[PDB]
């Protein structure tokens, strides 16, 4: 219904959305609810997402179950990934549950372990980003990744279950800040239609 071509944040039907790129061509069609369609080309970095911020300072147990029931028509022509994306605070962690990717499988390096969630096996990774932009300014924070061992582009992502598995692997879970269904592109072109994105909370 509404198409965005330039960096913007906002809300639609209760969902926080963002289009961002540092340079290049981007189009994000806001299609209601959690749904959005995007196209990129000639970009360095871009992202497209719809999700929800939680507010306050509450743990995943306090919030209740967080899940995404999603479907994406996913056609990256180069580097890209399709994931649930979000942040915790106390401690500050940028987290990723990646179900598909383009030419490169993120994040690199070697996994801490593997977990089994929503019928799929996920490699688990932890990294540190030093003095990088974040939801709390330029600072140092951890990244948590679950990355599916084989690509898929529709199904349920039970975010809470990844949180619990990460905890069991020793990765500390603080208060949940936001979670969103997210398409990233890097030095590439592509399209991705998130035609279904039902976020459920509790």
Author numbering: 29 to 230
Paper text:
We analysed a multidomain xylanase (Xyl) from the hindgut metagenome of the snouted harvester termite Trinervitermes trinervoides that releases xylobiose and xylotriose from beech and birch xylan and wheat arabinoxylan. The four domains of Xyl include an N-terminal GH11 xylanase domain, two family 36-like carbohydrate-binding domains CBM36-1 and 2, and a C-terminal CE4 esterase domain. Instead, individual domains and domain combinations were investigated structurally and for possible interdomain interactions.
Crystals were obtained using 10 mg/mL Xyl-GH11 in 50 mM Na acetate pH 4.8, 500 mM (NH4)2SO4 at 18°C. Diffraction data were collected on beamline ID29 (ESRF, Grenoble, France) and processed using XDS. The Xyl-GH11 domain crystallised in space group P1 diffracting X-rays to a resolution of 1.39 Å but yielding a low completeness of only 87.5 or 67.0% for the entire data set or the shell of highest resolution. This is a result of the low symmetry space group and a non-ideal crystal orientation, yet still reveals most critical structural details. The domain resembles a partially closed right hand with the β-sheets forming palm and fingers while an extended loop between β-strands 8 and 9 forms the thumb. The substrate-binding cleft of Xyl-GH11 lies within the inner β-sheet cleft. Comparing Xyl-GH11 to related enzymes including the Trichoderma reesei enzyme Xyn11 (TrXyn11), identify Glu122 and Glu212 as catalytic nucleophile and general acid, respectively. The latter adopts “up” and “down” conformations as part of its catalytic cycle.
